[PDB]
Structures are given as C-alpha cells and as structure tokens.
Design a protein around this ligand. Structure first.
Ligand SMILES: [Mg+2]
Ligand SMILES: [Zn+2]
Lengths: 115, 377, 57, 303, 44, 583, 57
C-alpha cells in the first residue's frame, strides 16, 4: 500500500531506528560473460544520517523543520538507532601514505636479530 | 429451582415474548406494517383466551414454533399482504428471522417438559405449516372473525417470475383458477382430529394454486396447436431455469435445500460450487451465532489457536432479466420430453420452496387435475 | 490490564520512591498492517526538583 | 454420501440398539444352554475383544482345527422359537417402525436406509453438510476452502475434535500462514496429556494406554523437520520429557538423535551413546536394521 | 474522544477489540487525551 | 515418511485424479446377501490356444435366466450374438473363478441360487458358446448358501461349510466329505463368505463378526486378531494374485496377504473410509509397471452411485504404501449393484445399477492430453388417458386462448387512450365514484361498529363493488397518483393505512419506492420476451395493485377495543400474562 | 548487521582494520544539554589501548 515518507520524530517516538532501504545490484556472471543474470536485492534497513542527502529533513527551512517536529535549527550528523541518538565518533588514526621512522621496543622482541 | 406445574405462565411468556421478537424483526427488517402487530395480539389473544378457557392442570397445549409461524401467516393473510408460506420457510431456514431455539443462547430456566414442548415439532417441512395454520384456523374460527382469502394474484406473479415464464402464463393460470373456483379460497381444513383420507389433501389454497400452475403449463404447452411456444424455447427455458447462478434468492434456496428432509435435494448440495460453499460458511458464521445451548478459557485460547476469521454478484431482477434475454430468440412427439423435464424442475423448486413432499404435491395436482377433467368432461 | 490465563484484572505499579506526575502517555501501535490491538505504551513521568541540600552549583 | 462428523441424532437408533442386543442376548444365551437397558447392551457388546515398514498383523498359526455343522433348520428354529416371544413383550413398547426394524433384522434382512439417511434436525443436518464439505475439499486439495470449512466447523459448539488430522494435513499442505501443523500437534499433546464407548476407535484415543496416530506422526514428522536440518536435542528433549515407557520407538528416535549428532571425544561420547540406546531399544518390540549396518555407519564414524 | 492520531491529528475514540490505528490515516500510533477531573495542589 | 526418513514432508509425488470414458455393453428397505454378474477370460480347448473373455450375465422376470456369451475385445469392447439358459430358482451370484499362475488358465463357471447350486462346463467354436449343465443339487439341507468358492466346489450356508468336488464332463453328481461350521448365534445378519488363501489348499470363512482361517486338509482353525467390537467385516475379495487379500471393514481398507509361506494376517498399516452403510462392497484392479505393482480399490454402495477409490503399490520387498484418496460420482436415481474390474493410470471395469438392466463399460484415465423423464408419478399426472380427456384438455386450452385474444383486442384501445382527456374524466369519476361507495361502506361500518367480538370488518379490502371501474384506465403513473390522492382524501381518521412500496419489496426483492418503478422493472423483463409486453405488464400491475388495494377494518383505534375486551372475558391471570413490549 | 554494530558498538571483523581495539567505537550522543551534545562532535581520543598504558606522555 504505496510508500510514505518517515521523519525522524516518528523514529524517536516509536523508539526504533531511522533507516532507508539498501539495494545492491548483484551481477551473476556465468562463464565469463556468456550468460549473466542481474537482480536488485533488498539488503535491509540501513540507518541514515540526519540532515544528510538520504534524510528527509535535508534542504528544509527552519519553518519546515518545525512543522515536522524537529528543532528549528536541527544540526543533524547523528543516527537514530532504537530511539537512541548515536554518533560514530571521530578517530585520530595515523597519517596516510607517509613513511614514518619508528623507534619502538616492541620491534626488538620479534627476535634476537631484530633491532 | 425451576417452576412446577404452573409454568404454564412462564411457558406462555417465553412463547409470546419470542413471537413479539419475531414481529420486531419483520416490521423492522422486512418493512411490514405496524398494524400486523395488532392483528397478532388479536389472534394470539383469541387462542390464548381459548387455552385459558380450558381447565386442566394437564397442559394439553402445543405451542410449537409452527404456532408462531401459524399466527403470523394467519394475520398476514387477513391483512391480504402478498407474503406466502415460502417467504416464511425461506426467512426462518436462513436464520434471518430467529426461530430454531428456545430463548436463543445468551435467559430463563424452565421445566424441561416445556423446553421439549418448544424444541420439539420444530420442522415445517412436510406441510406441517399448512396443517398447523389450518389447525389454528379451527382453534379460533376463520370465517366471521377474519378474512381468510389468500393473496392469489401476487402468488401468480411470484410464480411466473420464479420461473422465466412470459407474462401470458399469469393470465393463463389465473384463468384456469377462475375456471375451477371462480376465485374463492379458504383457510380452514379443520375437523379437529388426526383422521382424514379423502377430499382433503387439496384444500390449502396455495397448494392448489401451484397445482393449477403446473397443470396450466402442461396443458397450455402441449396443446399450442397454434405452435406459439417453440419445441426449442421449452428447452432454453429449462436451461435458463437450471443454470445455477449466485443471487440472494438461489443462494437462499440452497440454504433451504440443506434442511429439506428428502433426497435428492441434499444431493443438490452435493452439486454446488466453491463459492456456494463459501457464502454458505459465511451464512454459518453469521446466522449460526443464533445457536442453541480453567477448561473454558482453555477452549477460548484452544479455539483461538486457529483463526475464526465493484460488488460482484447480481440482484434478483437482474438475473430475471438476463434469463428472459437468454431465451429472447423467440421470434415432434419428443417435445413432450421438454414439457416433462421443465415441469419436473419447476416441481423441484416448488417442493423445496413451499416445504412439502414430492408425494404431497403430486397427490394434490393429481386430485385437482381429475377435478378439472371431471368439470370439463 | 486483563490477563486471560489468570481470569483476573492485574496492575503494573509505580516503582520509584520519588513521587511524580503523568506527563505524556503514548500509544505505540504496531505496523504489519493494523489488526493488532494495543500492546505497547510509553508513560513519561515528571518529577519536581526544588533544589535540595546536596545539589551542586 | 460421506461420513458425518456429528454425534448421530438419537432416540430411535438407541431403542433399536436395545431391541437388537436384547434379542441377541436371548438367542446366544439359549445357544450356550443347548451347548451345555443401556447396561444390557453394555455387557452384551462388552464381553468381546474390544521391504517397507509394514506394522504387520498376526498371521495364521496356533489356531484350533475345526467345527462340523451345528445348525439344521429344526435345531435353529429350536433355538429361535422362544427368545422371539420374549421379544414380543417389549416390542409392544417400542414404536411401529422400530418394531418393523426388529422384525426385519431378525428375519436377517438388512435395512435400506442409513442412520444419516433418516436423521432429521436442522442444525445437525447443516453440520453434516459442513463436515462433508470439509472432507470433500480436503480430498480435492482445496486447502483454502477446506480451511474455511474447518474454522467455521470448529466454531460450532457441538464438535469435539476428531477433526485434528484434517487440520494436521490441512495446515501441512497449506503452508500459508497460521502457526503450523507442528504447533497444532504439540498443542494437542500439551492440552490432552493430563486429567486437566461409542465414538472411539484407535485413530482418536485417550492417554491411559496408547494414544497412537497423532503422537507418533508428530514424532516422526518432527524428525523429518530435522531432515530439513541435515532442533534435535529439542525433539529428544520432549521425547526425553514424557514417561510412557512402552515405546522403544522413542529409544530408536533417541539413538537416531545421537547418530545424527555424530554425523572430538565429544563425538565419541555421542557414538557410545547411540551404541547404548540401540540395546536399551532391544528392550522392547524390536525396530531392527540388521544393525550391524547401524554399527557399520558407526565404524565409518570410528574413522 | 479519548485519543489523538500522532500523524494527522484527527481526534478519535476506541472500543473493545478495535483497530488500534487512525481511522483516517491508518497510522498505528495514538496519543491519549485527557478529561475534566479533580487534581488538587498547594500553591507553594 | 516411514521409509523416506527410516532411510536417513510432502509425499512421493504430485497430485493426480480421475476421469471417465463410457460405453454400452449389453441389455437384459432390508436387503440381503447377493451379487450376480461376471466376465472373465478362459479358453477350453488348450490344444495350444488362448483364453476368451466371456460374460455370465443375468436375465430377469423372476430372475430365472442365466446367460453365457463371448466378448471380443478391442479399444471398442463389444459382444457377439447371445447364448442362453434358464433355471426355476431365483438366481444369485454367477461366479467363474481362476486359480493364479502356479499352473493353468482355467475352465468353466458356477452359480448359486434360491434353492440350487449348479456348475456348468463349456465348449466353443466360431462365435458360439455351447455350455453343459453339470448337475444341480437342490439341497441336502434346506439351507440357503452364502458363497461358492473354487477342482473344488466349496459352499457356505449360514454358519457351516463344505469342501466338495465336481464331476468330469458327463452324465453320471457333485460330492463332499470334509465339512465344518462357523456358527455364531449372536450374529443375526445372514451373509457369511468363503474364499481361500495362498492357493495353499487352505480357506477363509467370514461373517460380519469375524474372520476365521481354516487349514482344511489338516485340522486347523483360527480367529484372526480383531473380532467385532467396533466394526463389521463388510466385504472381502482376493486381490487377484494368489497370495493377496483385500478386505473392506467399516472405516478401513485392509490389505491382508502372506509375507510368510504359511497363512497370514497383515497389519502393514491401512487406510480408512467413512460410513455406517451396511451395503458397501469392494473390488480391485491390478496394474503392472517397472518400479511398482499397484492396486486400485473400488468401494461402492447400494445407496449412492458414488465410487470411493484408494490405491496401493507392491514394490516386491513386500513394500506397500498409500498416496491419497479420491471419489467419483454416477448418474440419476439408483446405485451400483455390480462393480467389476478386469506417468498416468488407466483402470477399466463394468457397472450395473440397481434396477436397470443395462451393463456399462467404463474406463478411467489420469490427464487430458489427446433427463429423459419417465417419472411415473408425474407422467400419470400429465398424459391423462382417454381420447375425450385429450380433446377435453384441448377444448379448455382453446377456450382460454380465444379469451386471451379478447383481452388483447379489448385493452388495446384502452392503451390508445393514455393521458387523454377521456382517461382523465375516467380517473376522476372513477376516483371519487369509488370514494362515494367507500363512504357508504364506512357508514354501514358505523352501524355494525359496536361488534367488539372480532376486529375484522366484513369483506373489506376491495374496490368495493363497482368492478368495471377498475379495468378501463391504462396509465400506471396517473393511477398511482389517483391512489395517492385517495389515501390523501380519506385521511379523515379511523381508516386503514398500508404502504405498498415496502411490500413490493417482497415482489422484486429490492427497494421499490414507486408504484411505477415496479412497472418499469417488470416491463424490461417482459419486453425482452413478449409482444404487447406493455399491455400485459400494465394489465398485471393493475391486477396486482388491485389484489392488494387496501381497505381493511376501521383502523388502529378500532382493534384495541376488541383487543382489551377479549383480554377481559379471559380469566384473570392469563389476562395478567398478556404482555406487550417485552424488551 | 550494520544496525547491530550501531546498536551495541563493537568492531567485528577478521581484520582489525589496523586498529588497536575492539570496542568503544560508538557512543551515545548524550543530549543532557546542548553544550554536552555539541562537545561529542568535537571530541577525539587515541583509543582504549593507550588508556591502560602507565605512562604520562
Ligand atoms: Mg476380540
Ligand atoms: Zn491519522
């Protein structure tokens, strides 16, 4: 019975997750192309980031946000999962593609030969 | 606990209460006139006064359900309303008009002698209804007190439309009617007894009407020396009559076929189709809520283990129209066959519809057929 | 609520030692197309805090 | 023209049963003399024994040789002459049709009309048609309709459940929705295994001694719901649960659960386990493979 | 009219075993609504 | 299931059923012990020859006549001209047995009767079947005999049996020396049954109470494991292969048969079938295939023409399984007196129905890749006899036919005048002419008003004795308006009121608001079908509206008078019981 | 499966992903007040691995 939009306030009130359908176009190729089958697969409800290009609040004016029960200046950037607002927190990993010179005790313990 | 030996008073109260209940359903759901009710208080009043002009503590009353239907038909017939017995049979066998119970499952606990006096004799189906209406017509007298002329001509209409006969047969049969009777039709067949053995299979007016109707078709069609009625159109008539189609009516006649005493009509339920069975179970869950009579909740969950659970089919005059058209191509001794099979199918419908016997009907139309040959020869 | 297996009417009671007032009562209906009757409810309590001894400022 | 799933409309059939078994008593009584009431019917019917997996019968051997004619015309009418008048007494109390039935069955003629064929009450005749359409549709693979028939039927207040195999194979072939054949069966056993005659042959039964069909069929069919697998310790957990010791078939079910779980010293314990239950299944009326075959699978395991 | 639809706001009431859903929307989430009744307070 | 997961849940197979192929073959409450018709193939000559499929059919006035004649087979299975014989007894089963192929393809044929037991031989050549009467024995016993089995003539008479032998060809007759009995005083039903088992020279004897094996060339007797607690033995027939046994109980098809050289019971599980009918019988047909050997079980009745079929299979590990049930129907009134058999299934047989001398060949296939009424009760009512009772009927028919002509020509001009000023004058002087007569009858209702004994004022509901005034108009809507303004006119109270529309509801079965729409709907229906459907439909809506045209007793205030006054003469507490408005 | 990750917050792969710990990757965006909320999004740490290490550096 044709689809209707879901806004995050609903997710908050139902205490479930704010999610969109994730579709994969599967290529099933027999004998290197001789005969290949395609099928688009429903791979579940993928939690969506609020105020992103896959959220329904995207591009809404303050007035429209208020009409949709959101904060007037709702920032977004988080996910709603089982009613809880969860943020994947930022990690301070190393530095890409740069050869660091390391002196580390641990390196000496891979063997008596190791410096 | 329960009353002793003067539960006549309670008996007549569950009975009278059940009657007014049925009247409520027929003014309400059948759009009867409010006058009917007064006609019913008068008739039920006359026979109430006659059973309370009777002494004995031995009850000797029979207020079976046939008495309910008996005073309803009696009153309707005084009032000249075009309702006939088959309307009642249909109404009650389809659980619309509440009938087949004492104070249906929901009342009062009475002496089991009277619950038996209610539940017993329940069936109308061998002419018990005609016999009980004539019996009541003796119990209090039809003649001076009421006007016991049947609504004849509407029965003719009902009958032609019930077949697919062209409207000439209304006047045909109306004429044979006038020929033997000159249109005088009574209600009593009473000389209180059981005993009867000649003259009196055929004096319930209706049954004679059906007899004239059958006869008319047979004579009329077998002596159209004009050849007005084709050797074929009798077949096409038989087939448009035979084609089982799903209207409120035929579905009803199936529902009556289920509780008719004799085979074949139950083999007739055999030859029904998935939609007939489906609408049947529908009518079962609707009108067999009018049923009768720890572990209990264990059976509410136990039964609740398995689920209890642009308008398609057409109306009456729609079906009637369409078979009237199915024969609309209107404009040698084996045509007697067509006459016979048509007569026998028509008979079948009458037997289930008017709750009588094969043998009953043919006794009547035999007797009154000789009653026409005798006043013709 | 009424419990069928008990043929009795039972009662979820309030558990905090701190008294409160009822704010919102939400009826959380179910999807999978209607037919289902009420099974889930959210009750929001309001608790007064006139600032007490031991509160930090 | 099919069996009806309703208790048979009553009076005349019961008083005919009276006349029948009462006259039966008088004739067989005088017969043993010459060889020298619901309750009368009750004692009367009483004193009498009441390459593929064929539950074989008891064949012919150890049965006694012969008899040579007992009953000439004169001798039979000797036995018959008196009990027929004793019958003349209560025949005077029964109904004329019933009396005629007594006369005809006692001549040896068999009545034209079935109990159904002469039955008469609205509700019961309607239930007869309902149940009939159930059985017909189930024969016709019309599991949808048949299901509607079954639900509408069990709704009615008169029907206790013989109809369960109807719903077992019904929901089985249905696959459609509702908590399925297994759920129904284990429901049957959970409700009707605790204290909590006419109608009853073996395919519906009471739990004093063997309730057979439905139990063994949910048992095997559930082990086949493990054929879906390769659940087992569940099935043999509730085959472990009941005490109804005259089975052994659940011993072979048990040992089959251990052979299926045996497909490292754990697998050893499962193989010693099945080795045990095959003999404690030689306990009772034997289910036997050559069983050196069972052991040969167990040595393919011992690999 | 004890309840309110959470989506369309239509005021509506229920009964014994009734469709726990809005009779307009078909949304299955309903807010309770509340009725003349005595609650007593001390103005402190 | 049993073998599929004894090996280590649906079926073996998908779902297949029943179809027909029909042909004619030849033409001729308490019931008893009988079944009388056979067809089987043997050849007498055995100078290296073949078998001939023969029929032993039965001819009836009293059932005196036994008839034997040949069948030539084909895809079209017919006969060639008839050969005959009579007996003075009423005749019961024709039986022609055939021992299975341990040995030979067998000789000639036997019958059981009202007194007698006879056995015939036969020779045949060039489309004739000459038989010879191997001699009767009327009885030693004054006892009727239930069943014959078969060279060994075995008889059963109600509760005692005899093994016997037949003479060789000619003209010495049949003797016995080994005998017995299975008498049981407390089984009243007369049928017993003898058919033997394994060809071992050991027999089976039956009554509706039990099944007894008798090893009869030693001394041996056994009652096999059930008895008579919950069901009757209903029939038994040896499913043709020597070591094979097919038994109908009530609600069980039983496949007995040896799986040991000594005689058997099989409790290799079985199927069940659902009645109280005493009249059930059975027969099997046996089809051969590579992977199995399957048997079709026909259980039939004397009550309903339906046939009830189940199928089994013999994968000779002595493996037996069952698939699922199926049932077919059969035609008008009556029921089988004989059913006899001979990736898809073809199974073919003959049936003879209760009281119908016809013998019909039938064939049944798996898929599809390729009333004449003499109902003597009504015909006696329709054909009535004498010639003056033919021309009598015709005379009446002509009377009414010319009458109908009078109706047509009569009303025609009345149809010519519609909405005319003439029909207006007529509807006026009609309406209020009738009003004058109605007032008169209301005055003579005032004089008799104080009757208070009844509440039906005499001979009321009418046009009130002016009858020509009805017909002459012919415009339904202006007539409905006449009646609406007549009801309007007599609104002066104490007068009947009745609303037609709510009653036409009963006529057309939908809401009929107007007296007119009534006429419309009828007119559509009949304009499809008759000339002058407008004339008739108008004449019949006029006739209906008149037949109902109310004018009953003085209204609601008048009945309550007699209501209470009859509620008076009745004694006091029936009067206390009389109760309006219950709940 | 992604929902499970967001819901329970642990790293499940046969790969580490080149990271020194298996949990603590997500956290609730506590809305205790706004100041705390915004802080979450500007927070950075090294990971539970370097937290149990007993140096100050
Ligand atoms: Mg026994
Ligand atoms: Zn809404």
């Amino acid at each position: 019975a044709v689809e209707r939009k879901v806004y995050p306030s609903e997710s908050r009130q139902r205490l479930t997750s704010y999610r969109g359908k994730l579709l994969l176009k599967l290529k099933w190729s027999v004998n290197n192309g001789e005969e290949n089958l395609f099928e688009v697969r429903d791979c579940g409800g993928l939690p969506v980031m609020l105020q992103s290009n896959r959220c329904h609040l995207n591009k809404m004016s303050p007035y429209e946000l208020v009409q949709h029960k959101e904060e007037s200046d709702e920032i977004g950037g988080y996910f709603i999962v089982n009613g809880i607002e969860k943020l994947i927190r930022m990690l301070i990993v190393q530095r890409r593609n740069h050869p660091m010179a390391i002196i580390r005790p641990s390196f000496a313990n891979r063997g008596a030969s190791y410096s | 606990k329960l009353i002793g030996h003067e539960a006549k008073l309670l008996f007549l109260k569950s009975f009278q209460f059940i009657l007014k209940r049925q009247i409520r359903w027929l003014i309400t759901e059948m759009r009867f006139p409010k006058e009917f009710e007064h006609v019913a208080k008068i008739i039920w009043l006359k026979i109430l006064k006659t059973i309370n002009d009777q002494p004995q503590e031995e009850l000797k009353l029979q207020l079976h359900m046939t008495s309910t239907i008996s005073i309803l038909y009696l009153a309707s017939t005084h009032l000249s309303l075009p309702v006939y017995t088959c309307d009642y049979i249909k109404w009650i066998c389809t659980a619309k008009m509440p009938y087949f119970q004492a104070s249906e499952i929901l009342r009062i606990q009475l002496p089991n002698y009277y619950v038996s006096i209610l539940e017993g004799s329940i069936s109308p189906f061998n002419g018990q209804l005609y016999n009980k209406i004539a019996l009541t017509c003796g119990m209090i007298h039809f003649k001076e007190f009421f006007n016991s002329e049947i609504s004849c001509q509407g029965l003719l209409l009902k009958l032609v439309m019930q077949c697919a006969l062209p409207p000439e047969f209304y006047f045909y049969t109306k004429q044979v009617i006038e020929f033997e009777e000159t249109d005088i039709r009574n209600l009593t067949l009473w000389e209180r007894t059981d005993e009867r053995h000649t003259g009196r299979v055929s004096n319930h007016a209706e049954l004679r009407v059906l007899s004239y109707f059958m006869l008319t078709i047979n004579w009329m069609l077998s002596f159209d020396r004009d050849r007005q009625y084709p050797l074929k159109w009798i077949l096409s008539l038989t087939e448009s009559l035979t084609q089982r189609t799903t209207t409120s009516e035929s579905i009803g006649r199936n529902i009556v076929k289920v509780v008719y005493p004799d085979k074949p009509t139950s083999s007739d339920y055999f030859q029904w189709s998935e939609e007939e069975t489906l609408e049947f179970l529908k009518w079962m869950e609707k009108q067999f809520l009018p049923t009768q009579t720890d572990q209990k909740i264990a059976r509410r969950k136990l039964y609740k283990i398995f689920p209890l659970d642009s308008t398609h089919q057409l109306t009456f005059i729609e079906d009637l129209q369409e078979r009237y058209a199915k024969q609309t191509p209107f404009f040698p001794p084996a045509r007697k066959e067509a006459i016979g099979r048509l007569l026998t199918h028509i008979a079948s419908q009458l037997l289930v519809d008017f709750a009588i016997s094969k043998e009953q009907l043919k006794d009547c139309i035999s007797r009154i057929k000789n009653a026409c040959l005798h006043r013709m020869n | 609520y009424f419990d069928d297996t008990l043929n009795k009417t039972k009662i979820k009671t309030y558990h905090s030692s701190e008294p409160a007032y009822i704010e919102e009562v939400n009826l959380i209906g179910d999807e999978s197309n209607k037919f289902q009757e009420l099974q889930t409810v959210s009750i929001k309590y309001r608790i007064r805090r006139t600032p007490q001894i031991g509160d930090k400022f | 023209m099919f069996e009806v799933p309703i208790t048979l409309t009553n009076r005349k059939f019961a008083q005919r049963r009276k006349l029948k078994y009462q006259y039966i008593n008088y004739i067989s009584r005088r017969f043993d003399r010459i060889s020298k009431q619901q309750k009368k019917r009750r004692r009367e019917r009483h004193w009498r024994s009441v390459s593929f997996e064929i539950w074989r019968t008891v064949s012919s051997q150890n049965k006694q040789p012969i008899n040579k004619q007992k009953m000439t015309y004169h001798n039979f009418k000797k036995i018959e002459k008196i009990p027929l008048r004793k019958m003349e007494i209560p025949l005077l109390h029964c109904t004329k049709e019933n009396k005629l039935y007594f006369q005809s069955i006692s001549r040896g003629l068999e009545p034209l009309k079935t109990s159904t064929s002469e039955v008469r009450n609205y509700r019961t005749r309607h239930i007869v048609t309902l149940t009939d359409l159930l059985h017909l549709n189930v024969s016709r693979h019309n599991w949808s309709l048949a299901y509607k028939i079954f639900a509408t039927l069990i709704r009615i207040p008169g029907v206790q459940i013989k109809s369960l195999w109807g719903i077992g194979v019904e929901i089985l072939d249905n696959l459609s929705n509702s908590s399925s054949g297994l759920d129904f069966l284990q429901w049957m056993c959970q409700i009707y295994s605790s204290k909590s005659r006419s109608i009853v042959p073996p395919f519906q039964t009471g739990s004093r001694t063997h309730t057979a069909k439905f139990a063994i069929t949910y048992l095997w069919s559930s082990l086949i719901n493990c054929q879906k697998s390769m659940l087992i310790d569940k099935i043999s957990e509730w085959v472990l649960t009941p005490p109804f010791m005259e089975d052994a078939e659940v011993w072979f079910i048990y040992a089959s659960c251990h052979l299926l779980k045996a497909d490292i010293n754990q697998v050893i314990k499962h193989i010693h386990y099945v080795r045990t239950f095959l003999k404690i299944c030689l306990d009772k009326g034997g289910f036997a493979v050559p069983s050196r075959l069972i052991e040969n699978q167990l040595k393919s395991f011992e690999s | 009219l004890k309840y309110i639809c959470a989506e369309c706001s239509s005021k509506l009431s229920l009964s014994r075993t009734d469709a726990v859903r809005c009779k307009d929307c078909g949304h299955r989430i309903l807010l309770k609504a509340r009725t003349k009744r005595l609650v007593q307070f001390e103005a402190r | 299931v049993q073998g599929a997961s004894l090996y280590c849940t649906l079926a073996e197979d998908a779902l297949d059923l029943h179809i027909v192929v029909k042909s004619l073959l030849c033409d001729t409450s308490q019931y008893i012990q009988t079944a009388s018709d056979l067809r089987n193939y043997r050849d007498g000559t055995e100078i290296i020859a073949y078998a001939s499929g023969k029929t032993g059919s039965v001819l009836n006035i009293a059932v005196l006549t036994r008839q034997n004649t040949l069948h030539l087979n084909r895809h079209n299975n017919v006969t060639s001209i008839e050969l005959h014989s009579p007996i003075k007894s009423i005749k019961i089963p024709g039986a022609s047995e055939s021992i299975g192929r341990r040995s030979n393809l067998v000789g000639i044929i036997t019958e059981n009767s009202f007194q007698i037991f006879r056995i015939e031989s036969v020779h045949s050549r060039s489309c004739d079947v000459m038989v010879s009467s191997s001699e009767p024995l009327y009885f030693v016993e004054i006892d009727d005999l239930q069943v014959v089995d078969f060279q060994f003539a075995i008889i059963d008479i109600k509760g005692n049996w005899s093994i016997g032998r037949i003479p060789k060809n000619f003209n010495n007759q049949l003797i016995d020396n080994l005998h017995g009995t299975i008498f049981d005083p407390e089984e009243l039903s007369s049928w017993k049954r003898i058919e033997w088992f394994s060809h071992f020279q050991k027999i089976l004897v039956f009554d509706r109470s039990k099944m007894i094996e008798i090893d009869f060339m030693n001394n041996w007797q056994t009652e096999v494991v059930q008895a008579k607690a919950w069901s009757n033995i209903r029939d038994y027939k040896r499913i043709d292969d020597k070591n094979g046994i097919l038994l109908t109980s009530r609600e069980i098809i039983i496949v007995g048969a040896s799986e040991s050289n000594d005689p058997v019971r099989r409790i290799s599980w079985k199927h069940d079938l659902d009645p109280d009918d005493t009249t059930l019988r059975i027969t099997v047909q046996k089809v051969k295939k590579p992977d199995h050997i399957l048997l079709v079980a026909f259980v039939y009745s004397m009550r309903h023409k339906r046939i009830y079929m189940h199928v089994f299979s013999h994968r000779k590990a002595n493996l037996f399984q069952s698939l699922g049930c199926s049932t077919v129907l059969e035609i008008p009134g009556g029921t089988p007196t004989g059913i006899e058999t001979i990736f898809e299934l073809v199974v073919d047989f003959l049936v003879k129905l209760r009281n119908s001398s016809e013998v019909y060949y039938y064939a049944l296939s798996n898929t599809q890749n390729s009333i004449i009424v003499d109902h003597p009760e009504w015909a006696s009512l329709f054909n009535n006899a004498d010639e003056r009772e033919k021309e009598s009927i015709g005379a009446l028919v002509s009377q009414i036919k010319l009458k109908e002509r009078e109706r047509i020509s009569r009303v025609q001009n009345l149809i010519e005048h519609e909405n005319s000023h003439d029909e207006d004058k007529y509807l006026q002087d009609l309406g209020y002419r009738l009003s004058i007569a109605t007032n008169e009858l209301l005055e003579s209702w005032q004089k008799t008003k104080d009757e208070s004994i009844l509440s039906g004022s005499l001979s009321h509901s009418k046009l009130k004795n002016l009858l020509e005034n009805s017909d002459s108009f012919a415009s339904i809507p202006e007539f409905s308006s006449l009646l609406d303004q007549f009801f309007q006119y007599y609104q002066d109270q104490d007068v009947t009121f009745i609303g037609f529309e709510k009653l036409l509801h009963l006529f057309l079965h939908e809401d009929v608001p107007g007296l007119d729409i009534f006429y419309n709907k009828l007119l559509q229906c009949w304009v499809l079908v008759s000339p002058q459907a407008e004339l008739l439909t108008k004449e019949i809506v006029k006739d209906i509206i008149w037949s109902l045209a109310r004018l009953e007793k003085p209204s609601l205030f008048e009945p309550i008078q007699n209501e209470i006054s009859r509620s008076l003469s009745g004694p006091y507490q029936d009067i206390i019981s009389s109760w309006d408005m219950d709940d | 499966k992604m929902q499970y990750f967001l819901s329970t917050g642990n790293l499940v792969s046969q790969s580490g992903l080149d990271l020194q710990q298996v949990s603590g990757y997500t956290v609730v965006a506590e809305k205790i007040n706004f100041y705390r909320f915004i802080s979450h999004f500007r927070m950075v740490h090294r990971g539970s691995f370097f937290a149990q290490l007993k140096t100050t550096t």
